[PDB]
């Protein structure tokens, strides 16, 4: 069944847009670190950008990829224009969340979580 | 006299029916259905890609001068294939009337932006996107308007929990406001209020 | 009719009293515990019994529209008093 | 376990952790960090305070409704100590002044008060006692601070045999003394150092790591009556450490050697202040003293905490001391200090 | 009009956390009629609800 | 005429019972008006009315210098008024409690308590419900 | 109908032109505004002397909550949970069980005053006039906990303000 | 003791000035800010008690949080509270500031400003009356009257 495309037609142009967004985010990390006076390193910011990109690597639908890159562009323009504060940039890192146990024995000890 | 019952306006009902037939005949390519509610409110259901032609006609036509966009919202009905329902309310000052145009869309289907017809459509479509995830193709500046910066998910969808997933507090260790998973001291108490006896026989659906 | 628990903490009309080993009694240190001294059960027991020479009596709680919804008590069971349950008021047919 | 002490939830702000902890000296640096961690866990925290209640305002948002209780306390009143440790199964002791006041001495704040707390807590039936001491706690130490620390450690161990005695090396953080004291010598021209800081070795420890180690000691059941040494992952000379501090602060570093007697006289001069002294003779001795090495005692790696290096969290503390010219300079612009390992 | 040979999956777009995406089993069912009443107007639409999780007692006010 | 105004001021000075009372009411009430005494409650508060003033200033209360066990010479609260005089002062009725005493009930507080927040007598919340689940108690006798 | 708020043109006769020139050179309207403010200065201030004088109120005013009793001393509440069902903010928590004498009475009746919106729906839905919103409004506290009322606190408020609450209900019960 | 008497008089003098000169920051969020206007209005004039609104947080002693605190607004409130110089006091006004109020179970509302800033006085209502807010302000003044910083320091 044919569906109306948002962008990119097939997957190749979607990957091209993903790479363009990745370049834009990669060239913005030093400026974000300098302006926001973050205590993190530039390497940490680049690694976090890489991690955020990688958690959607299993998407095989061009429209979903287009929406993902649209939202990425939105959250990048929020960072460039300093609409976000240091609060949100550090929210990307979950610095205050306690490490959730992942093994069966620890999950059994702590509570009733699956 | 029946003081406890609202009076009815058959004249306005007939006028709205005639104008609905008029617009349906003028625009057969996009108009799918026309209805008139018993409280005299005309309603037109069109194809999603007919938004620009239908709105342009309803704005510029001599007999339909709907120069004002009253409101623009979305309705979420998860049981439908095209869950999102885009609703436009138009006001004609020349003829002192109101009309409603309804179209449908899903998560991955863009809707043509009507900013070229009505200027209020800019912020109305920004709010619709922010609250439902409906994307508008040719929007001059599409971004979040009401939600917090970096907020994930669209709150007004029916599948979004009432309290969300995250909450904010001040953490003294990091000397900044932090976002943590939501946790309520008292859980919201859900009430089942629907009576098991049918109230309005006029709206009874076939058993099927 | 307030009563004191063995831990020195007063007991409310609902029977609430923190156990000896319960840590939650720390909230009452350097402060007090909010206990209402007037016991509704004791007062309503102190109320007397009204005698009426009719099988069915009506109670509205007194005051009319300022009371409770009007109810009818059937005074046929001679082994007990008929109690209006909105206000806990006992009525009884004149025996003997 | 009492039915009200069974843990519930997912370790959130509104959860139940089953820990009822009385934190003595919570109106301080390590105290505020420990109270923050406890409130984040969702534990019941009792905060005995002797100061103005206004000075305890920063502790209010650290816990949920009713999870923080503030009670007055004397230190010389065993009645008040019992009142505040009556219903708590954990007692944490962090009371201590780096100087001496008219009413309290190093003997009172490090021997008498910890001994009274340990003795009264044992009578009250407190399950766990954590006592904070110094890493360089030697009875024959030149510093009365460290002598009193060692004597009080022995007294606490005698009174409460199942105690956990923690010996941090030198805690650095936003509100600390160490980095702030070293970076506040800009006003006094150059930086006076004993033997130019070439004969002193220190390994400071991070405040968050110390607080997490204190928290984990409570939760770990096999650390009841033990002794721990909390130290950083790297050891630095005093000269190199101060040079790195000034480089991060982007301040002109002008070290100069000052003889020990002259430094002692200078420290004696500054301790005449009725208010908080800027420096004291005991502080000078502690700065000059090299941090002891205790490989036999366990540590943060044994408690499950990876020690945070200074190079990662130095800019959090020393950015405040920079000028507008260097406020926005990044963390990587300064080369890491020279270690002695 | 492109053609996609894929199954619809908007999990990455809904914004739900991975825990509540993976570890959740909903129950699709028609609600049972309440035995206390003879009405049958609540047994006509299908319902979707999630599995019950832990509820504890607040230390304050219970 | 300024003379009449000055004479009214002197009357206000002498209407409070000399210079000392005038100064007391000036420093602890910031107003030196004179009005008829409607009544006095059991705690020492006095209530005055002056219908010539505009609505709002026509009724007022001079608080007592000591209520319950707190010295309120300077620390006067708006919650120190008993409920009947509270109604009269807030103008929910035109009838003072002296003219129209409230209905007497055996459960009504005899001594009114002000806002006790920040004091040891402050309200502390707690659950009024019993324990929902009773846990099993193991036998005290040995086995085997 | 309609009217024009500003569509008047000034006359161009010599007298009017000279008057406008005098108004421009000599600040006539500015002096007029000064005179208005001077008149207000010489008027009487409209400030009441709180806390010795209180603002007007009505019997319908809704403030602090209270639980009432029957004249016999028995509590009016019958644990019917209508107030809990109708509360817009879900600020009422009720738990009930049969009393020792078999009466239908509450064991837990909590109101969160930091969650309540003071809308008065609970006293409309009460069929026995048990829960009321009393006239007291000066009950600010220093801690968040003190605003979480329970059944004992509400009964104490009822016993404290029973006279005024009864008087207000007597005054305003014929409009309901 | 002579020193004890001197410090008692000194910290009575200091507390009097701060009690009698309160400068709230001009900060209103929602409908509760209208009642602040009515308190500043002639009927319940706050200027009598030495309470004067100032725009800048640097020149403010009291922060009156009167309105719904949202997730998008909380960083700004914390920032202005931090920029207020000590001593600084906080008065939360209305249900939204105290707890959650009508929007307690909302994805975009902070359930109480005490999760962000240390609150000194809580004023209940929706909205609290002007008299209720004035009573809260006077209660804050009485709370300041009992502070003994110099008396704590002398025995420190
Ligand atoms: C300005 C340039 C620098 C000047 C330096 C200081 C100069 C001297 C300052 C003089 C201060 C005068 C204070 C007068 C007391 C206030 C009046 C009185 O009412 O205070 C009462 C008592 O106040 C306190 O108890 C103590 C007040 C200060 C005690 C005096 C301390 C020593 C002053 C002299 C030392 C100055 C030399 C040392 C510093 C330079 C409390 O009143 P309050 O309840 O609130 O009122 C509420 C409103 N009501 C009445 C309607 C309810
Ligand atoms: C010493 C104490 C003095 C006290 C005086 C105070 C007066 C009351 C103060 C209230 C007003 C104060 C706030 C208002 C400030 C602004 C007022 C103002 O702007 O006035 C200037 C006003 C505004 O101009 P526009 O409206 O913009 O029109 C321009 C059209 N293109 O214009 C002016 O410049 C008028 C200035 C007045 C000058 C005096 C008049 C001169 C007449 C000369 C006659 C005498 C000739 C001398 C020769 C004599 C030969 C025999
Ligand atoms: C020469 C100019 C004199 C410098 C004037 C000092 C002005 C104030 C500077 C200052 O206060 O620094 C003291 C500072 C702490 O004060 P704060 O900055 O307020 O810290 C914040 C506390 N919450 O004290 C320190 O930490 C450094 C003390 C080290 C002792 C230095 C002694 C050496 C000076 C004499 C050398 C003699 C050589 C011969
Ligand atoms: C006739 C002979 C003369 C008689 C009068 C003699 C004295 C006159 C006043 C002289 C100046 C003040 C002298 C010192 C006053 C006490 C200051 C002090 O030590 O305050 C201690 C304390 C600081 O905090 P602390 O408890 O130490 O804890 C540390 C962190 N919490 O607490 C504080 O710091 C509290 C905060 C305020 C401290 C400063 C104000 C003290 C009182 C000053 C009154 C005069 C003010 C004049 C101002 C200039 C003119 C307008
Ligand atoms: N900071 C460091 O570099 C290191 C410190 N330690 C030790 O750890 C402990 C905590 O350190 P730290 O947070 O830096 O110290 P702080 O000086 O910052 O805090 C001390 C705490 O104890 C209280 N206190 C002090 N003296 C007394 C007294 N006489 N009576 C009652 N309470 C008193 C203080 O309250 P108040 O303000 O009311 O007086 C405050 O809450 C101390 O024992 C210290 O020796 C160990 C290793 C390193
Ligand atoms: S006044 Fe309204 S919001 Fe408050 S408890 Fe009553 S019903 Fe609930
Ligand atoms: S509506 Fe009245 S009787 Fe019913 S539960 Fe509420 S307070 Fe009790
Ligand atoms: S408490 Fe009520 S009046 Fe105040 S801001 Fe919230 S909704 Fe508005
Ligand atoms: Zn009855």
DSSP annotation string for F102-120? PPP-TTS-SS-----TTST
What is the DSSP track for D237-283? EHHHHHHHHHHHHT----EEE--HHHHHHHHHHHTT-SSS-S--HHH
Distance (Å) from the alpha carbon of D208 to chain C's nearest alpha carbon: 28
Neighbours of G142 (CB within 10 A): 19
Distances from the Cα of B38 to the Cα of B32, B42, B44, B99, angstroms: 20, 10, 15, 14
Are the C-beta atoms of B139 and B113 separated by less than 8 Å? yes
Contact F129 E62 (CB under 8 A): yes
Nearest CB to B164; choose among H70, H107, H116: H107
* Max CA separation in chain E (angstroms): 60
Strands of C13-88, DSSP E: 50-51, 56-59, 71-74, 82-84
- Report the distance separating Cα A40 and Cα A27, nearest Å: 16
User: Which residues 2-31 of chain A have a CB within 8 Å of chain E?
Assistant: 2-5, 9-10
Question: Do chains G and A touch, with touching meaning 3 or more CB–CB pairs less than 8 Å apart?
Answer: no
Distance (Å) from the alpha carbon of G85 to chain B's nearest alpha carbon: 8
DSSP code at position D67: S
Ligand 3 center from residue B46 Cα (angstroms): 78
- Report the distance separating Cα G153 and Cα G159, nearest Å: 10
Neighbours of E51 (CB within 10 A): 10
SS3 G141: strand
Indicate if ligand 8 lies below 6 Å from the C-beta of H68. Answer: yes
Half-sphere exposure of D152 (CA within 13 A, CB side): 32
Indicate if ligand 8 lies below 6 Å from the C-beta of H117. Answer: no
Are the C-beta atoms of A39 and D316 separated by less than 8 Å? yes
Backbone angles phi, psi at F39, to 5 degrees: 180, 180
Helical (H) or strand (E) element with D227: strand D227-230
Contact F78 H131 (CB under 8 A): yes
Are the C-beta atoms of B134 and E37 separated by less than 8 Å? no
SS3 H128: coil
Annotated binding residue at G102? no
Q: Does G28 contact chain B (CB < 8 Å)?
A: no
Indicate if ligand 6 lies below 6 Å from the C-beta of G120. Answer: yes
- Report the distance separating Cα H1 and Cα D19, nearest Å: 44
Q: Which of H29, H109, A91 is nearest to B149 (CA)?
A: A91
Buried b (16+ CB within 10 A) or exposed e, D100-125: beeebebebbbbbbbbbbbbbbbebe
Are the C-beta atoms of G111 and G153 separated by less than 8 Å? no
Are the C-beta atoms of G77 and C64 separated by less than 8 Å? no
Backbone angles phi, psi at H11, to 5 degrees: -80, -10
CATH assignment of the domain containing G105:
3.30.70.3270
H2-155 is classed in which CATH architecture?
Answer: 3-Layer(aba) Sandwich (3.40)
- G131: alpha, beta or left, given left = phi > 0 and alpha = psi -120 to 50? beta
Are the C-beta atoms of A46 and A26 separated by less than 8 Å? yes
Buried b (16+ CB within 10 A) or exposed e, B156-194: bbeebeebbbbbbbbbbbbebbbbbbebebbeeeeeeee
Indicate if ligand 5 lies below 6 Å from the C-beta of D25. Answer: yes
Give the mutation target among D31, D104, D275, D277 for probing the ligand 4 site: most ligand atoms within 8 A of CB: D275
Neighbours of D331 (CB within 10 A): 20
Are the C-beta atoms of H119 and G144 separated by less than 8 Å? yes
Distances from the Cα of A26 to the Cα of A79, B95, C69, angstroms: 13, 56, 74
Mutate to test the interface with E, among D11, D16, D43, D46 (most CBs of E within 10 A): D16
- Report the distance separating Cα B44 and Cα B29, nearest Å: 13
Q: Does D10 contact chain A (CB < 8 Å)?
A: yes
Indicate if ligand 8 lies below 6 Å from the C-beta of H16. Answer: no
Ligand sitting nearest the alpha carbon of G158: 7
Domain spans of chain H, in order of start:
2-155
- Report the distance separating Cα H54 and Cα H52, nearest Å: 6
- Report the distance separating Cα A64 and Cα A87, nearest Å: 28
Distance (Å) from the alpha carbon of G147 to chain E's nearest alpha carbon: 12
Are the C-beta atoms of H97 and G129 separated by less than 8 Å? no
Question: Do chains D and A touch, with touching meaning 3 or more CB–CB pairs less than 8 Å apart?
Answer: yes
Q: Copy the structure tokens of residue D51.
A: 């100061």
Are the C-beta atoms of G93 and G110 separated by less than 8 Å? yes
Give the mutation target among H70, H94, H99, H128 for probing the ligand 8 site: most ligand atoms within 8 A of CB: H94
Backbone angles phi, psi at G107, to 5 degrees: -105, -40
Q: Which residues contact C11 (CB under 8 A, 6 or more apart)?
A: C2, C3, C4, C5, C17, C35
F82 burial via Cβ count (<10 Å: 0-12, 13-18, 19+): buried
Chain G interface residues (partner D, CB cutoff 8 A): 144-145, 148
SS3 D285: helix
- Report the distance separating Cα G40 and Cα G46, nearest Å: 11
Distance (Å) from the alpha carbon of F118 to chain H's nearest alpha carbon: 8
- Report the distance separating Cα E56 and Cα E62, nearest Å: 9
Indicate if ligand 2 lies below 6 Å from the C-beta of G25. Answer: yes
What is the DSSP track for H61-94? SEEEEESPPBTTTHHHHHHHHHHSPSS-EEEEEH
Distances from the Cα of H5 to the Cα of D51, H2, H9, H11, angstroms: 19, 5, 6, 10
Q: Which residues contact B61 (CB under 8 A, 6 or more apart)?
A: B26
Backbone angles phi, psi at G25, to 5 degrees: -75, -45
Ligand 9 center from residue C88 Cα (angstroms): 6
- Which chain B residues have a beta carbon less than 8 Å from that of A75? 150
Ligand 6 center from residue H99 Cα (angstroms): 14
Are the C-beta atoms of D93 and D24 separated by less than 8 Å? yes
Q: Which residues contact A43 (CB under 8 A, 6 or more apart)?
A: none
Q: Does D65 contact chain G (CB < 8 Å)?
A: yes
Backbone angles phi, psi at B181, to 5 degrees: -60, 145
Give the mutation target among D278, D283, D317 for probing the ligand 3 site: most ligand atoms within 8 A of CB: D278
Q: Copy the structure tokens of residue H65.
A: 């949080």
Q: Which residues contact E5 (CB under 8 A, 6 or more apart)?
A: none
Neighbours of F83 (CB within 10 A): 23
Distances from the Cα of H116 to the Cα of A89, A103, B165, D28, D174, angstroms: 18, 34, 19, 20, 19
Are the C-beta atoms of G156 and F76 separated by less than 8 Å? no
Q: How far apart are the first and last CA of chain C?
A: 34
Q: Which residues contact B144 (CB under 8 A, 6 or more apart)?
A: A74, B126, B129, B130, B151
Are the C-beta atoms of D244 and D236 separated by less than 8 Å? yes
Ligand sitting nearest the alpha carbon of H148: 4
Helical (H) or strand (E) element with F25: helix F18-29
Helical (H) or strand (E) element with B70: strand B68-76
Distance (Å) from the alpha carbon of E41 to chain D's nearest alpha carbon: 38
Q: Which of D12, D14, D38, D40 is nearest to D26 (CA)?
A: D38
Contact A64 E13 (CB under 8 A): yes
Strands ordered across the beta sheet of F59-62 = F36-40, F46-49, F59-62
The parent domain of residue G68 ranges over: 64-175
- Report the distance separating Cα B113 and Cα B118, nearest Å: 10
Half-sphere exposure of F60 (CA within 13 A, CB side): 24
What is the DSSP track for E23-45? S---EEEPPPPPTT----TTSSS
F118 burial via Cβ count (<10 Å: 0-12, 13-18, 19+): middle
Q: Does B180 contact chain A (CB < 8 Å)?
A: yes
Backbone angles phi, psi at D282, to 5 degrees: -65, -40
Q: Copy the structure tokens of residue D229.
A: 């040494």
Nearest CB to B177; choose among A3, A78, A87: A87
Task: Give binding residues of D for NADPH as ranges.
Answer: 25, 27-31, 50-51, 94-98, 145, 149, 169-171, 177
All partners of chain E with 3 or more CB pairs under 8 angstroms: A, B, D, F, G
Nearest CB to D330; choose among A33, A96, A113: A33
Annotated binding residue at C84? yes
From the alpha carbon of D171, which atom of ligand 5 is closest? 3
Closest Cα in chain F to C22: F131
SS3 B171: strand
- Name the experiment that determined this structure: cryo-EM
- Around ligand 7, the residues with Cβ closer than 6 Å are G 77-83, 94, 125-126, 128, 130-131
The parent domain of residue D156 ranges over: 1-341
Query: CA torsion, points D323, D326, D329, D331, in degrees to nearest 10?
Result: -60
Q: Which residues contact D297 (CB under 8 A, 6 or more apart)?
A: D167, D227, D228, D229
Give the mutation target among F63, F74, F79 for probing the ligand 1 site: most ligand atoms within 8 A of CB: F74
Report the domain count for chain D: 1
Q: Does A3 contact chain B (CB < 8 Å)?
A: yes
Q: Which of B110, B104, B103 is nearest to B136 (CA)?
A: B110
Indicate if ligand 6 lies below 6 Å from the C-beta of G117. Answer: yes
Are the C-beta atoms of D210 and D313 separated by less than 8 Å? no
Strands of chain F, DSSP E: 36-40, 46-49, 59-62, 66-67, 70-71
- Report the distance separating Cα D340 and Cα D233, nearest Å: 11
Are the C-beta atoms of H106 and H100 separated by less than 8 Å? yes
Ligand 4 center from residue D273 Cα (angstroms): 14
DSSP code at position B208: -
């Amino acid at each position: 069944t044919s569906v109306k495309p948002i962008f990119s037609r097939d997957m190749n142009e979607a990957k091209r847009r993903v790479r363009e967004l990745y370049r834009a985010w990669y060239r913005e990390v030093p400026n974000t670190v300098h302006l926001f006076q973050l205590d993190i390193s530039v390497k940490q910011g680049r690694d976090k950008v890489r991690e955020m990109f990688m958690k959607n690597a299993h998407v095989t639908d061009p429209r979903v990829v287009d929406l993902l890159v649209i939202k990425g562009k939105m959250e990048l323009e929020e960072t460039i224009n300093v609409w976000k504060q240091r609060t949100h940039i550090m929210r990307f890192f979950h610095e205050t969340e306690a490490p959730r146990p992942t093994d069966f024995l620890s999950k059994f000890y702590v509570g009733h979580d699956p | 006299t029946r003081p406890t019952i609202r009076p009815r306006n058959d004249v306005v009902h007939k006028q709205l029916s005639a104008f609905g037939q008029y617009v349906a005949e003028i625009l057969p390519k996009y108009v799918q259905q026309v209805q008139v509610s018993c409280f005299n409110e005309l309603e037109i259901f069109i194809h999603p890609d007919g938004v620009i032609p239908v709105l342009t006609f309803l704005r510029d036509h001599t007999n339909a001068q709907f120069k004002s966009l009253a409101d623009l919202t979305a309705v979420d009905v998860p049981t439908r294939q095209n869950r999102f329902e885009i609703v436009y309310n138009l006001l004609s000052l020349r003829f002192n009337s109101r009309i409603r145009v309804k179209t449908y869309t899903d998560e991955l289907t863009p809707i043509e932006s009507s900013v070229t017809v009505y200027k209020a459509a800019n912020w109305y479509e920004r709010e619709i996107w922010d609250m439902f995830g409906v994307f508008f193709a040719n929007h001059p500046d599409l971004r979040r308007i009401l939600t917090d910066y970096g907020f994930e998910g669209h709150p007004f969808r029916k599948d979004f929990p009432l309290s969300g997933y995250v909450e904010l507090r001040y953490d003294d260790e990091v000397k900044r406001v932090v976002a943590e998973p939501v946790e309520l001291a008292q859980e919201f108490r859900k009430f089942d209020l629907n009576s098991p006896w049918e109230a309005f026989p006029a709206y009874r659906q076939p058993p099927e | 009719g307030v009563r004191t628990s063995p831990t020195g903490e007063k007991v409310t009309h609902t029977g609430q009293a923190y156990d000896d080993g319960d840590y939650r009694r720390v909230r009452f240190s350097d402060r007090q515990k909010e206990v209402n001294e007037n016991f509704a059960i004791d007062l309503i027991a102190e109320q007397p019994v009204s005698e009426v020479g009719s099988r069915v009596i009506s109670c509205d709680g007194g005051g009319g529209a300022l009371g409770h919804p009007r109810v009818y008590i059937n005074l046929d069971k001679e082994t007990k008093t008929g109690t209006c349950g909105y206000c806990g008021l006992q009525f009884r047919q004149p025996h003997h | 376990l009492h039915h009200a002490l069974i843990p519930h939830g997912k370790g959130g702000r509104s959860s139940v952790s089953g820990i009822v902890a009385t934190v003595f000296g919570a109106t301080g640096f390590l105290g505020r960090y420990v109270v923050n961690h406890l409130g984040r866990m969702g534990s019941q925290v009792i905060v005995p305070y002797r100061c103005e209640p206004y000075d305890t305002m920063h502790l209010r948002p650290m816990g949920d409704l009713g999870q923080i209780i503030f009670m007055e306390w004397n230190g010389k009143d065993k009645d008040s100590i019992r009142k505040v440790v009556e219903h708590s199964n954990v007692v944490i002791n962090l009371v201590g002044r780096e100087w001496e006041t008219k009413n309290f001495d190093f003997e009172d704040v490090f021997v008498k008060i910890p001994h009274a707390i340990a003795q009264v807590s044992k009578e009250a039936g407190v399950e766990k006692l954590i006592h904070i001491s110094h890493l360089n706690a030697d009875i024959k130490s030149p510093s009365r601070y460290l002598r009193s620390k060692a004597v009080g450690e022995k007294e606490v161990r005698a009174a409460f045999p199942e105690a956990t005695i923690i010996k941090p090396s030198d805690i650095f953080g936003r509100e600390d003394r160490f980095l702030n004291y070293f970076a506040s010598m800009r006003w006094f021209g150059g930086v006076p150092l004993i033997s130019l800081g070439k004969e002193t070795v220190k390994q400071p420890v991070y405040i968050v790591d110390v607080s997490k180690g204190i928290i984990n000691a409570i939760k770990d059941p096999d650390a009841k009556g033990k002794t721990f040494a909390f130290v950083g992952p790297n050891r630095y000379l005093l000269f190199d450490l101060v040079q790195y501090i000034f480089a991060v602060a982007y301040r002109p570093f002008l070290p100069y050697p000052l003889p020990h007697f002259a430094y002692r006289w200078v420290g004696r001069l500054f301790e005449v202040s009725p208010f908080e002294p800027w420096t004291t003779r005991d502080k000078v001795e502690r700065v000059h003293m090299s941090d002891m090495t205790l490989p036999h005692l366990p540590g943060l790696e044994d408690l499950g905490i990876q020690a945070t290096p200074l190079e990662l969290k130095a800019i959090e503390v020393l950015r405040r001391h920079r000028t507008y010219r260097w406020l926005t300079s990044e963390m990587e612009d300064v080369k890491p200090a020279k270690t002695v390992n | 009009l492109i053609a996609v040979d894929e199954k619809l999956d908007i999990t990455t777009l809904t914004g739900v956390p991975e825990e509540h995406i993976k570890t959740r089993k909903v129950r699709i069912f028609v609600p049972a009629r309440n035995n206390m009443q003879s009405g049958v107007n609540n047994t006509k639409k299908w319902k979707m609800e999630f599995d019950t999780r832990e509820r504890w007692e607040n230390p304050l006010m219970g | 005429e300024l003379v009449q105004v000055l004479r009214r001021g002197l009357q206000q000075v002498s209407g409070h019972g000399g210079l000392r009372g005038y100064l007391r009411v000036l420093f602890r009430a910031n107003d030196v008006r004179v009005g008829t005494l409607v009544g006095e409650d059991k705690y020492g508060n006095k209530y005055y009315e002056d219908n010539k003033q505009f609505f709002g200033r026509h009724r007022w209360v001079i608080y007592t210098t000591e209520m319950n066990g707190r010295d309120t010479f300077w620390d006067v609260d708006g919650s120190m008024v008993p409920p009947e005089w509270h109604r009269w002062l807030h103008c929910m009725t035109d009838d003072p409690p002296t003219t129209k005493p409230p209905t007497a009930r055996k459960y009504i507080w005899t001594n009114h308590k002000f806002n006790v927040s920040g004091t040891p007598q402050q309200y502390v919340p707690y659950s009024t419900t019993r324990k929902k689940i009773q846990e099993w108690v193991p036998p005290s006798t040995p086995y085997k | 109908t309609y009217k024009f708020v500003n569509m008047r043109e000034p006359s161009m006769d010599m007298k009017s032109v000279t008057d406008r020139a005098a108004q421009t050179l000599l600040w006539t309207e500015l002096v007029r505004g000064l005179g208005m403010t001077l008149s207000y200065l010489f008027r009487e201030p409209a400030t009441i002397n709180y806390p010795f004088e209180k603002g007007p109120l009505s019997p319908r005013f809704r403030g602090e909550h209270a639980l009432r009793r029957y004249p016999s001393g028995e509590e009016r509440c019958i644990a019917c949970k209508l107030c809990e069902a109708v509360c817009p903010a879900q600020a009422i928590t009720i738990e009930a069980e049969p009393r020792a004498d078999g009466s239908r009475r509450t064991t837990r009746y909590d109101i969160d005053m930091t969650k309540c919106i003071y809308c008065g729906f609970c006293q409309e839905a009460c069929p026995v006039d048990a829960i009321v919103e009393g006239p007291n409004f000066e009950f600010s506290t220093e801690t968040h906990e003190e605003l979480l009322y329970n059944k004992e606190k509400l009964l104490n408020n009822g016993d404290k303000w029973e006279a005024e609450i009864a008087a207000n209900i007597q005054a305003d019960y014929l409009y309901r | 003791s002579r020193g004890e008497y001197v410090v008692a008089k000194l910290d009575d003098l200091v507390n009097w000035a701060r009690r009698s000169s309160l400068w709230p920051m001009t900060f209103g969020l929602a409908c509760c800010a209208v009642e602040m206007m009515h308190m500043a209005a002639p009927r319940y004039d706050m200027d009598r008690f030495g309470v004067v609104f100032r725009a800048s947080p640097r020149q403010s002693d009291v922060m009156i949080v009167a309105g719904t605190l949202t997730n998008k607004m909380a960083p700004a409130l914390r920032k202005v509270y931090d920029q207020m110089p000590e001593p600084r006091y906080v008065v939360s006004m209305g249900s939204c500031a105290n707890g959650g109020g009508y929007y307690h179970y909302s994805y975009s509302v902070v359930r109480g400003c005490d999760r962000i800033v240390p609150v000194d006085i809580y004023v209940p209502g929706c909205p609290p009356t002007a008299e209720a807010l004035l009573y809260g302000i006077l209660q804050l003044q009485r709370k300041i009257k009992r502070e003994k910083r110099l008396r704590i320091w002398y025995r420190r």
